[PDB]
Design a protein around this ligand. Structure first.
Ligand SMILES: O=C(c1cc(Cl)c(O)c(Cl)c1)N1CS(=O)(=O)c2ccccc21
Ligand SMILES: *[C@@H]1O[C@H](CO)[C@@H](O)[C@H](O)[C@H]1NC(C)=O
Length: 515
């Protein structure tokens, strides 16, 4: 089939335009996942109280800070309490002679009247809308876990649907579903409905990812395939900065969600001009349509060979795969063979480490630094060169050292972030950025490396298993933040430990670079 591609053009105008078109949609797809750093930002909050918040109440000569001290006790963080208020105004606490021994838990009560939120940075957020605070604080990571579980289920459903219906058709309807569900989520009346719509949006996100990746491979020459994969990866790097800019411009969660969702109506529209995979059409016994698609691509590339292509070469050339693909093969086959068992274990561990670490760290930037807009931007700024250098290094120094070093660097940088004093926010932010860049380089390295570790018959099965492992770990990513009750260092300790152990294991893989 590579000869058919050469007759049509293995890397030309068509492939360039297609790659750009898909990269834009990947940028917006990235914005969809990173949105909840801003859409679900936690502002500073406190109980509503009469002396502070009922502006119609009798005025006094006291300043706002004195009223805040009179109304709200100091909390565990050595800062104003976020979930308890004084039952009666503590006038006794106003003099400098007072001491904390003068009041007890009997004087406190939960926020009967609700919470007051800081509006300086964000005009509105999900947390403020549905009071995902205090006793309900766990509901934010639950929502993110539901979104990632939606991705996992969408990936499970995409494969059979893609094979039965086609790459481009499923990509089109995934675009449409993303647009519809993202717009609907912006106007959700209640939190469970928001969760439902986010789940159904992730369901389509999975299809967009998988079919973009698949469709780029099948129209590209084998020699250029890794480079095209790397550019597809750079699409997310651009998505990060796009998220930072749009969130800087749009401080309202509904408008932000709507803005990042609307573009997918345009993606849905131009998906119709993309050609369906010719490999899929030939395999499914539709050579007449495959000829149309192939000569369309040749016309775009400007080749004269449209006068020479005929159904006979189309039918015969791919026939070998049409015959050999009739065997169903399974994940159990990988673990039966003694030699492949070890490679499979380590490869799946590395996939899991990538997914777990990335979606653990990237969705709580608020804990890593002071300014999340700038941090979000710099993640992409560093991700671009990290991914390109990963490509260069793995082509020059090998897959094994590159993957191992990337994972070790990410883990060591994240572990250091817990060790640095909290007051040095700049250094911690830099370490966080470097860790995430290392994670992106590791994603590139594992994507290229996993294809080369397995025999051609079992290649796709092992890669699918690895991807499922990564998407499973992504779910556990957010849940680990609930360990923050015992201190903010513990989640970062886990996030840093996992990549270190998986990177050390990667040193036990064989090298696949040609001599
Ligand atoms: O969600 C994925 C992804 C996961 C798997 Cl397991 C894949 O196979 C593919 Cl193609 C993509 N990414 C790849 S990323 O550049 O790290 C990145 C950065 C930011 C947001 C998402 C994301
Ligand atoms: C605020 O204070 C006024 C004082 O007249 C009172 O009528 C009103 O009910 C109070 N509102 C709340 C929410 O406490």
């Amino acid at each position: 089939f590579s000869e058919l591609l050469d007759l049509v053009g293995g890397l030309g105008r068509f492939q360039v335009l297609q790659t750009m078109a898909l990269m834009v949609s990947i940028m917006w797809l990235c914005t969809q996942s990173m949105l909840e750093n801003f859409s679900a930002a936690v502002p500073s909050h406190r109980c509503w109280a009469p002396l502070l918040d009922n502006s119609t109440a009798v005025s006094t000569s006291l300043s706002p800070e004195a009223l805040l001290a009179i109304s709200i006790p100091p909390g565990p963080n050595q800062r104003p309490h976020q979930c308890r208020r004084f039952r009666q105004p503590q006038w006794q606490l106003l003099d400098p002679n007072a001491t904390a021994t003068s009041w007890s838990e009997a004087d406190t009560e939960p926020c009967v009247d609700g919470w007051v939120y800081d509006r300086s940075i964000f005009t509105s957020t999900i947390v403020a809308k549905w009071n995902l605070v205090c006793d309900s604080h766990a509901l934010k990571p639950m929502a993110q876990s539901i979104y990632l579980a939606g991705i996992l289920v969408g990936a499970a459903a995409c494969g059979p649907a893609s094979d039965r219906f086609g790459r481009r058709l499923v990509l089109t309807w995934s675009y449409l579903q993303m647009a519809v569900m993202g717009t609907a989520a912006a106007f959700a009346p209640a939190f469970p409905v928001y969760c439902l719509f986010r789940f159904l949006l992730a369901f389509a996100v999975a299809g967009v990812m998988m079919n973009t990746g698949t469709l780029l491979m099948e129209w590209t020459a084998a020699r250029a395939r890794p480079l095209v994969m790397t550019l597809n990866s750079l699409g997310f790097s651009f998505g990060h900065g796009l998220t930072a800019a749009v969130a800087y411009g749009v401080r309202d969660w509904t408008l932000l969600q709507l803005v990042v969702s609307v573009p997918f109506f345009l993606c849905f529209l131009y998906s119709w001009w993309l050609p369906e995979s010719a490999r899929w059409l030939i395999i499914k016994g539709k050579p007449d349509q495959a000829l149309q698609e192939l000569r369309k691509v040749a016309r775009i590339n400007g080749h004269k060979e449209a006068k020479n292509l005929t159904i006979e070469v189309l039918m015969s050339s791919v026939k070998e795969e049409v015959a050999s693909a009739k065997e169903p093969r399974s994940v159990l086959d990988l673990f039966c063979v003694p030699g492949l068992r070890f490679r499979t274990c380590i490869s799946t561990l590395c996939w899991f480490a990538f997914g777990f670490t990335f979606f653990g760290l990237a969705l709580d930037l608020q804990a890593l630094g002071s300014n999340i807009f700038l941090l979000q931007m710099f993640i992409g700024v560093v991700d671009i060169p990290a991914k390109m250098g990963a490509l260069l290094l793995l082509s020059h120094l090998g897959r094994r050292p590159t993957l191992a070093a990337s994972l070790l660097l990410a883990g060591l940088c994240i572990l250091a972030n817990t060790l640095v004093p909290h007051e040095m926010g700049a250094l911690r932010s830099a370490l966080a950025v470097l860790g995430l860049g290392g994670v992106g380089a590791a994603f590139t390295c594992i994507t290229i490396y996993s294809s080369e570790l397995f025999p051609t018959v079992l290649r796709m099965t092992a890669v699918g298993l690895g991807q499922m492992a990564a998407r499973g770990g992504a779910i556990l990513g957010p849940l680990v933040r609930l360990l923050g009750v015992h201190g903010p260092w513990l989640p970062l300790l886990v996030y840093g430990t996992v990549p270190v152990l998986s990177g050390l294991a990667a040193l036990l893989l064989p090298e696949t670079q040609s001599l």
